[PDB]
Design a protein around this ligand. Sequence first.
Ligand SMILES: *[C@@H]1O[C@H](CO)[C@@H](O[C@@H]2O[C@H](CO)[C@@H](O)[C@H](O)[C@H]2NC(C)=O)[C@H](O)[C@H]1NC(C)=O
Ligand SMILES: *[C@@H]1O[C@H](CO)[C@@H](O[C@@H]2O[C@H](CO)[C@@H](O)[C@H](O)[C@H]2NC(C)=O)[C@H](O)[C@H]1NC(C)=O
Ligand SMILES: *[C@@H]1O[C@H](CO)[C@@H](O)[C@H](O)[C@H]1NC(C)=O
Ligand SMILES: *[C@@H]1O[C@H](CO)[C@@H](O)[C@H](O)[C@H]1NC(C)=O
Ligand SMILES: *[C@@H]1O[C@H](CO)[C@@H](O)[C@H](O)[C@H]1NC(C)=O
Ligand SMILES: *[C@@H]1O[C@H](CO)[C@@H](O)[C@H](O)[C@H]1NC(C)=O
Lengths: 1286, 119, 173
Amino acid sequence: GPQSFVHFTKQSLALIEQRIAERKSKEPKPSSDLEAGKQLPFIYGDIPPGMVSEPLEDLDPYYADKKTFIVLNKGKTIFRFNATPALYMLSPFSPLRRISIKILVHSLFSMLIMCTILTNCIFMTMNNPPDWTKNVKYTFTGIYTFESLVKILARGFCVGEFTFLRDPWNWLDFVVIVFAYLTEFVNNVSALRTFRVLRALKTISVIPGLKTIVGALIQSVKKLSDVMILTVFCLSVFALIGLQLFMGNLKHKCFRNSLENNETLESIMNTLESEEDFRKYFYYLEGSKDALLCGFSTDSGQCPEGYTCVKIGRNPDYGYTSFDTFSWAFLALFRLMTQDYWENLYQQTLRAAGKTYMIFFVVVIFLGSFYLINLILAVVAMAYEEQNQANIEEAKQKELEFQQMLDRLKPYWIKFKKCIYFIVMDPFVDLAITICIVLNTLFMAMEHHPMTEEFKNVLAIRNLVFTGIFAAEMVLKLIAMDPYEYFQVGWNIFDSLIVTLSLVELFLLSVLRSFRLLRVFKLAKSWPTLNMLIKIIGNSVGAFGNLTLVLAIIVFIFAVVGMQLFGKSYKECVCKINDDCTLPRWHMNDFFHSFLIVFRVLCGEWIETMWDCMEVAGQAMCLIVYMMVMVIGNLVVLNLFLALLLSSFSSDNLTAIEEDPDANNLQIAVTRIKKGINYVKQTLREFILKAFGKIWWNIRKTCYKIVEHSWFESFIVLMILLSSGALAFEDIYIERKKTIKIILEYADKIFTYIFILEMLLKWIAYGYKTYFTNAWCWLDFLIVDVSLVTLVANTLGYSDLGPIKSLRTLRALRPLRALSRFEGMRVVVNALIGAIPSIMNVLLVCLIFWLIFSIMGVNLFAGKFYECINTTDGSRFPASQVPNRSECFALMNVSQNVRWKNLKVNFDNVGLGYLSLLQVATFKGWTIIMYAAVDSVNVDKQPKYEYSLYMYIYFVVFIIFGSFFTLNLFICVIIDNFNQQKKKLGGQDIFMTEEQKKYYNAMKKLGSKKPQKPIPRPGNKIQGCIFDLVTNQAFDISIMVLICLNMVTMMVEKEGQSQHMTEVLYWINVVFIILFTGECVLKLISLRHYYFTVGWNIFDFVVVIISIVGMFLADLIETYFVSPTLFRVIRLARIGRILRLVKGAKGIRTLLFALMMSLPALFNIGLLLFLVMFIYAIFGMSNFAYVKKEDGINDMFNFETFGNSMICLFQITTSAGWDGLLAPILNSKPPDCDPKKVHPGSSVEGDCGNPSVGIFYFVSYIIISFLVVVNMYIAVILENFSVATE
Amino acid sequence: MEVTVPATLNVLNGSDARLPCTFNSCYTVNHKQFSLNWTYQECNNCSEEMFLQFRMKIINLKLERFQDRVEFSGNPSKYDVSVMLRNVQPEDEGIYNCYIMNPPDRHRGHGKIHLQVLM
Amino acid sequence: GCVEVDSETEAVYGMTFKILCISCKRRSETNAETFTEWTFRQKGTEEFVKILRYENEVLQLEEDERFEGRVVWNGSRGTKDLQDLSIFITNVTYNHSGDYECHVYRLLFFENYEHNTSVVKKIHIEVVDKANRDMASIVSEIMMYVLIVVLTIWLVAEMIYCYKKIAAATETA
Ligand SMILES: *[C@@H]1O[C@H](CO)[C@@H](O[C@@H]2O[C@H](CO)[C@@H](O)[C@H](O)[C@H]2NC(C)=O)[C@H](O)[C@H]1NC(C)=O
Ligand SMILES: *[C@@H]1O[C@H](CO)[C@@H](O[C@@H]2O[C@H](CO)[C@@H](O)[C@H](O)[C@H]2NC(C)=O)[C@H](O)[C@H]1NC(C)=O
Ligand SMILES: *[C@@H]1O[C@H](CO)[C@@H](O)[C@H](O)[C@H]1NC(C)=O
Ligand SMILES: *[C@@H]1O[C@H](CO)[C@@H](O)[C@H](O)[C@H]1NC(C)=O
Ligand SMILES: *[C@@H]1O[C@H](CO)[C@@H](O)[C@H](O)[C@H]1NC(C)=O
Ligand SMILES: *[C@@H]1O[C@H](CO)[C@@H](O)[C@H](O)[C@H]1NC(C)=O
């Protein structure tokens, strides 16, 4: 009955308790479409007006028996309550219940609460509330008490199975209302007002929809159990390794030698307390807050003469960076695993514990930060992907049932108007307009800092004329087309907003001059990828708009919480985070700066702020707050990223509409041009015609037979490697190694001669055609020719001439010949070249988009970055004096050491705009630019501290748009391309050799024997008792617990531990070792000759042996010889007893299977990456061996040698701090450098570098590393998906 | 540097008077700069007078009518600089001042206490 | 950007010689104020007698007939942080053969302290009528040549062998 709409009455109640009487005297699930908050089924049709906001009968049969009723409203949404008397005090037919339930369902009620929430928030952000607020607060508490009582009146607090208490989100209502009551009267000091913040979480339920969003987020975090277990496991193991190796190496400090007045280190260290004091005794590199790390090794940093290495003192970075104890080791491995500012960790550990420990950081940065982040990404994506399919499978199901159930139930102005509308002829006038657009943007792109007067004049007048054209086109159209329909179209809508703003400036924001650039986006009609970008952005405020909003409210909550907890602390507790005793530049006193710190924590630069936080306001709360921010944000941001990205891949369309279905302007005007160009091609081309011996074949087979012989290929590869090493020996220390210099010079001739013979043989073998149609052969040909060009020149004595000299520098390309020989590298390069057409599209889109942002920047900031610093200290002179350039120059002419100096990467031009945006978008070097933008005043004016504070919003918007959305476009494109390729191959692996393929299939097959051998009970009784003893389900569990106890006994160690506790742990270790050996030999007893038939058992055996021998050898090496480093390296062998812990775990054994499964392809990509590193390192050693020691470049991290060059290149492979290395390369002219400086003992005379080649080198490297790493990422993620699909 | 002091102090005549000056300074108090300035004044019009201080060690100037009755009874390290008044008389009724400067925190603290004597 | 490179020891007669003496600081930035002095023992004699002393920017020379007019500074010029203290002998004579060593007396100036230090570097000079090319060059010249020629042979000969096999191939054909 679709008309089962009656009023809820008493005889119904006399009936509801009727059935229930005999149901309890005799001893179905509720409809999934009727629960509260949803919409009433259409089949029931319309609700009569006399029943709206009235109690209705509960139609659900499973709820039909129970004491309950349903309420519906104008929005057709279900409210279900219980018909018991309110608190057993007010029956459902009291009038007060009626009026109150009407006022409960009222939509203006929800609007009221939403508005109170928003005003509450806008007041939670005022740091220092004034007097009016205490009163407002009163009002707010009143409103929330009113909204609580309205529910609990009808809702109850009593248990009728339905109550105020049941529903979860009202628990928040209790906690807030009670906290309002307590503190208003009682009058923990740190966290007084925070719990108010929890009111703002009621946005989650007042605003509709977010409830499902949070539900799905908490569902996506459900599948992170295995991955987070593995992550903590791995970080703890690398913490044990780091703690073993570097315990206390960060406390090495360069100490004075001539200790005056007969004092030992002990006598002085106690009595030292000021930074200044320490400097009198330790060497602090100029202008740093921490004394220098040194080392007792050749490969370590070195102390200046007169200072000797000693481990006494605090640790660097306030004491927060150290491997001293397991806790700080775990924190340091975390900052590594998230690759946050590990530049300093890398450099500090390598400076203190010597440079050959790069290996550790290599193994972590690969197997940790890379792999663990990959794991998290993959599992989150899998879960969200299954969730999206869960929605879609319901989506067609719900649609299908409804359709079947529905089916089963069954004057002069007109002339001039049409004239101009014809003159709006589409195939022409639109293209003329888009040309006007492009000419405009490339005219505003000629903005640059030092402009001649006539140049700004011409720029002005050209803008004016272009605004004239666009405005005239707008009015043409408004008049001709029907006005009511002019505003109908979206582009028209955009364009009308833009033309208005244009006429606004023509009336004149200051910024808005920059907004003519939005008109670039019109090109989107005929440029499909920009259409894709616009759809991506549209899905941020569109369908996936709820997610964005959660993200917005979460960032707001963390901003307000951080402010409330730490805002005052950053104010009194500050003279310990800035020696001038002023607030630092990045803090949490206000709401804007809180917000900024929360934004940065999302961006992944979370530790410098954390040290300041911890120093200022305690270690427990800071850590918990930062760690909550990181995790919550990073899960939501990922979820947002993933949602958009999976919408891009296939849900955007199912080829429902063709590419530009209606005749596009690009597709019609070409025809009107096709009828033109062919008219050119047919008419004048006709008019100009109107007006006017076998022995060669034998030898060819011989040579061709030689070339494909295996010995030939091996020999050539051997020569390739020898040439490449000969390259590597040529560093600045080669003036010493004489005989090696001479041998290298002669070997040059030998390999040149070999490779020339190679190419000559190849010619005859293949002929100039086949040889010259192949790219690899062309490359080798170019390399051998440039080689022989160099040889001849040297002979002729024209070596001195520069082109030859600069052709030498191209010798670094000799490694390139290695590519075509190893197949694995060849197939990776083949794959990566396959994709480059799509990268071209996307790079052009990101390039034009950043161009818009870069012209915006040039209009805003250009030339305002100048400051007048003092060189001695390095400080901006205060703006009170040196007000402007002019008084900076009078100053310069009176005193010295002052230079009105630029930023060297700034917004003076558009090209520098691009460089600066790349620095900002990768989060490297971006802080100094932002810091200098927000100090801006005006050209020739001295910056003031945070004068235009709110320019940070420029960079905020830029990160969100140019970095976040563009990467989303890139990642999508790259994935489509790779799936496109895979499919074209037929789905096969795209990065593995044939061999690699067969071994991969085998090693996939190995993980498939679920069932094993019988292992029958052995004959003799007593050893049979041992058999069923060892094979007990719990004996292995006991071993596992013993291993966990072993793990904690390893964690207990710490720097500085007493001679007692060291030997206590020693015997605990040896009893553990004895016990493990005993359980092992027990295993051998049962499985006579059969212990070795399952691999894990061999693992246990070998771990036992390593464990025994490591303990013995440590004893021997401590007794006989003196050997700390060897001691600690062989002592870490005891970690083997941990690693068997994974054996029991079954969620970690599948992920490690996935890793080892994917290993081959990563080895291929690692080879390619090593080759690129190698070439780029040889170029480094050639070019920048003599740049001045400045920022990233220093004494041990430079390009003076293969060691140092390869170290810096590995560091910036993860794009860590490439701005630091680029900074000294950029300087080319005095006083930024010196081009006639004689480096002692060598002939190169230039201290400063070439900007142009410096930029090309570093930008290129970061891009190539990005692509190869993205390939790494695809490999890992694709395997994870594939191996989990079982 | 907030100063926690009782604004009004009533102590029985001839009894012991606890006059608590305290502060919450986030910086570790170090004796080589931290200073305590202990002054008192009777009527607002009449002049302020100093009786105790702390530059390097606790200094008592041993004043007339303040002689042999005042000794420091707190310890600066735990932010307690309370002093005692032995066997109060009707005379010491007045307004007591504790001035604290705790470098490197710039803000100069200030506590005020009104001491009244009941017969 | 100093590299320490040893001096050459074979001064051909009658043409100029440059004696090397490089001394970089351990950590490059530290300021310093070096001065050097040089000593020599003639071949066949037992004592080292001072020859030149470079300090400030002067090259004050102790009078000795042998080195009176033929030495000129070719060190680091016009700085007081000299890290290269080499000398140049303009017309080498047989009298200048000997053992010459230098001493650099640095005074690094550091944060609150100054640490005077010394390094002595020793060289031997032998004068000859004419240059003899270094042994390495000779051994290698002969070496590049030898390998190149032999290698050609492995290639040339092999090709004949194969050509013959190919000839056998023609033979079956
Ligand atoms: C540039 O900075 C230097 C470094 O402080 C200033 O030189 C100092 O001047 C003060 C004078 O008040 C002296 O007490 C210091 O001893 C000087 N230090 C040094 C290292 O010389 C210099 O005055 C600054 N220049 C300007 C123009 O202010
Ligand atoms: C640069 O700043 C200074 C600020 O003092 C200006 O120079 C002064 O201008 C005022 C007003 O005319 C007068 O006191 C003198 O003409 C100047 N005094 C001093 C101390 O220089 C100057 O005009 C500013 N503007 C420029 C040219 O950039
Ligand atoms: C050095 O100091 C010690 C203090 O332990 C003292 O006993 C000794 O006499 C002193 N030596 C000199 C030469 O002053
Ligand atoms: C500096 O000031 C003096 C003051 O007389 C003036 O003569 C001179 O032109 C100014 N500029 C320079 C570069 O000396
Ligand atoms: C060396 O001196 C003699 C004169 O004593 C002179 O003939 C000869 O040219 C000089 N050679 C050089 C290189 O000065
Ligand atoms: C110390 O410096 C003086 C000059 O002041 C010098 O004569 C002496 O040789 C130097 N000693 C050392 C140790 O170099």
